[PDB]
Amino acid sequence: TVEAFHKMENMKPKDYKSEVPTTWCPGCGHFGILNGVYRAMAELGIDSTKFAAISGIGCSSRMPYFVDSYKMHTLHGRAGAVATGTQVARPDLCVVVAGGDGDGFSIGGGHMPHMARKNVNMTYVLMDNGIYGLTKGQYSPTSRPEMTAYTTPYGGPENPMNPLLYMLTYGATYVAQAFAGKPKDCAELIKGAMEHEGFAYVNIFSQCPTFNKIDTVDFYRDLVEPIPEDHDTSDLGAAMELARRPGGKAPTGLLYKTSAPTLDQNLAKIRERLGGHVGYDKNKIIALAKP
């Protein structure tokens, strides 16, 4: 049970700013996502002493430095892995993972399915800019084929992958999508993602004006299409159809949400059935080694 929600009163977004100034380029969509994280923490009255923000490697992964809470800057693609050890060891903390599209679905694509499968109670904020930003503009698993980029001067020889469809297939119990230019969409979907008990994934389009020349703000604004409220967020098949972009337009809103046991709860059931506790008489275990 997370004990960090609704512990502080009359909180503003600026209370969660840290002493570290931002390093992102002016106009970068990561500012909106960071601002959506701030508003989300404020609307929940989060005691940031019980808040863990763990990131991988990339421009996107520099976000924990800018948040006033417990935080980790780990290796490329290993954030969700490191975060799982954090969440399991201390189920009381509110755990959030932040990283880019290359960080998550390229080097980190091996850890993605098991995060969602095991239903670890944490939030994954993936900033999807369709390019490798910090390494100066190499194409990513979400880049469109016609794009010409750093290591692809003659176009992309493969199609992009569907981040929402991946996570729905992996079995995430909270799947949402937003645009960085709608900072109140980010704040709301991130808010519901944190309160949700399970693996919550939030895919947020974030423009990169420095290196990405075709996935621009105007493009993302036309690409999105907000989900109608009459959509059933318990219909996995309807959410997978939404993820597959009907009519070519990417959905924004809540796609799928369901309640299911989390990893730390199932780990607890194992200890409960054994009557396990910190003060177990360890001499019983050694007694089994008598000849």
């Binding site: 935080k71 290993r78 060891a89 903390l93 396990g276 360890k282 001499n283 000849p291």
Partner: protein, 572 residues
């Protein structure tokens, strides 16, 4: 005088070769004897040649021995596999008549004891009890305590019924009669039963799992690999009882990543793997060094390189343990010797990780993983427990604050006013990225002086032998240490001027202590089971000793006679 007896039993797996070895060990243990076992499973899961070798003695044992004194073959393949070692002077029990072979020209001087094992099992209409007939035969011929031997079978077969236990007991004394019917000519006898000492029997891998639990383990993340998977099995079974958790990650990178996540959250965490796994953990172990996050990795060494020989014996991961990280990324590297160290040094590993906020690597091996020993029964209060330096709350918190001992106090999440970041980028006192020249020189000296300061707290490099000047000094590590102990028992008993040193802290290494040893040694011999002479390499680089590498790399450990023979050549 001979105080030990070495009995090797071989045959087709499924005929009870492994269980019969464990029963003999438990019987000698209930009779107050020291036991040192070593077993090999068939090379394929589906079946094949299995081998168990048990050693019982009235004094302490330190390795497996040069070769067997008594051999017991359940079939012909066991005979042909060991025929080169059936030398004159040894006892030989085999399945005859009724078996699937007739032994070749038995060399003159071999005390052969043909026992119809398959016949008596077939005469009882139950071939499943073939291994029981050999237990009765070996108990009679070589004085295995029949009361403790039947007691071990009673504890194991009592839960199936009164007719199941009485039936296997009938096969025991049937082989007892077949044995005593023959003329005992061998001079080989198990020492007479003493007072049963308060001890336990435990395999090396199980000892690592226990050592982690006794050391305060709270989180374990594993991925299966031979020969280290057993450690996860013990921890998955028993750690949930003590309020901890085990998770089977998707790979070794994810496993060590989870360890850091739980260690940053404040829990004592560890993992176990082998050669291929340690090489995959290299990048994350550097992150552990940079961010100063405690973590323990036990590498049960197998044969290499690459997939190598997963089931054989080798201690070849010393180059990887020390130089396995990109950039300047040192580690604290230990190596166990026996089942005793597999408990104490796994505790020591968690402590040194807690004390120094650094990645600690504990080197085991594939033999020691499965070898069972008799060790004094451990008590949870016997072990010193060290915890990470916690912030006192006074002042403004800095995760990487510069102190006089370079150990910045840690703070688990939830501690008020202690919000901080653990990072892999080079950083300043507050954890913020810092690419400046002076800060990189400053932080390298902080983390290196911190880890090098283990030499002022952890000292495990025993010295035994002559006290004065010596003709030959012997330095070895790992389970090879126990092999050299018995070699030193024999070398000193002949009055040779030799001394030995048994380093168990491999990195950082006490260069000054090495020079103190090699100063009293004309020649220095370094026996290790790896091709390049890896410990000898770090001796030429860091100390003034010019060693003589005695390197073998055939998937088999050393024997004491190999060490003794190598020393006498260099004495001259």
């Amino acid at each position: 005088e001979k105080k030990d007896l070495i009995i090797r039993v071989a045959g087709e797996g499924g005929e009870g070769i492994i269980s019969s070895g464990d029963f003999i060990a438990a019987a000698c243990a209930r009779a107050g004897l020291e036991v040192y076992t070593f077993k090999t499973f068939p090379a394929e899961i589906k079946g094949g040649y299995a081998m168990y070798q048990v050693r019982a003695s009235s004094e302490k044992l330190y390795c497996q021995g040069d070769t067997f004194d008594v051999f017991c073959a359940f079939n012909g393949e066991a005979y042909e596999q060991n025929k080169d070692k059936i030398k004159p002077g040894t006892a030989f029990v085999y399945d005859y008549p009724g078996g699937d072979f007739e032994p070749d020209e038995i060399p003159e001087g071999v005390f052969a004891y043909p026992i119809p094992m398959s016949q008596t099992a077939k005469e009882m209409k139950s071939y499943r009890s073939k291994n029981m007939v050999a237990l009765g035969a070996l108990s009679e011929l070589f004085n295995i305590s029949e009361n403790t031997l039947k007691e071990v079978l009673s504890d194991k077969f009592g839960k199936k019924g009164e007719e199941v236990l009485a039936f296997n007991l009938e096969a025991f004394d049937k082989g007892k009669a077949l044995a005593k019917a023959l003329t005992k000519a061998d001079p080989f006898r198990v020492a007479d039963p003493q007072e049963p000492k308060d001890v336990i029997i435990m395999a090396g891998n199980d000892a690592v799992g226990l050592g982690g639990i006794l050391g305060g383990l709270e989180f374990f993340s594993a991925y299966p690999i031979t020969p280290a998977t057993e450690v996860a099995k013990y921890v998955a079974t028993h750690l949930p009882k003590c309020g901890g958790d085990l998770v089977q990650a998707e790979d070794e990178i994810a496993s060590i990543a989870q360890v850091l996540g739980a260690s940053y959250a404040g829990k004592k965490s560890m993992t176990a793997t082998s050669g291929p796994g340690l090489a995959l953990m290299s990048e994350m172990l550097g992150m552990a060094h940079m961010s100063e996050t405690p973590c323990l990795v036990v590498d049960v060494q197998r044969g290499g390189p690459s997939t190598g020989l997963p089931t054989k014996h080798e201690q070849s991961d010393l180059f990887l343990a020390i130089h396995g990280g990109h950039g300047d990324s040192p580690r604290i590297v230990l190596s166990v010797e026996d089942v005793k160290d597999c408990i104490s040094m796994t505790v020591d590993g968690l402590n040194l990780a807690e004390k120094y906020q650094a990645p600690v690597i504990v080197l085991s091996d594939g033999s020691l993983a499965f070898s069972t020993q008799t060790i004094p029964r451990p008590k949870p209060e016997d072990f010193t427990i060290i915890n990470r330096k916690t912030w006192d709350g006074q002042g403004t918190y800095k995760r990487y604050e510069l102190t006089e001992d370079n150990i910045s106090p840690m703070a688990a999440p939830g501690t008020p006013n202690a919000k901080h970041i653990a990072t892999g980028l080079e950083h300043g006192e507050t954890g913020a990225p810092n690419y400046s020249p002076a800060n990189h020189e400053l932080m390298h000296r902080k983390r290196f002086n911190k880890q090098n300061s283990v030499l002022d707290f952890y000292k495990n490099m025993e010295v035994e032998g002559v006290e004065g000047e010596a003709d030959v000094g012997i330095i070895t590590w790992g389970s090879t240490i126990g092999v050299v102990r018995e070699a030193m028992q024999r070398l000193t008993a002949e009055g040779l001027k030799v001394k030995a040193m048994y380093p168990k802290l491999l990195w950082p290494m006490p260069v000054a202590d090495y020079d103190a040893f090699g100063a009293t040694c004309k020649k220095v011999i370094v026996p290790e089971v790896n091709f390049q002479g890896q410990l000898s390499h770090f001796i030429r680089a860091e100390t003034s000793i010019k060693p003589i590498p005695y390197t073998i790399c055939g998937g088999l450990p050393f024997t004491p006679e190999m060490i003794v023979n190598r020393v006498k050549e260099e004495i001259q």
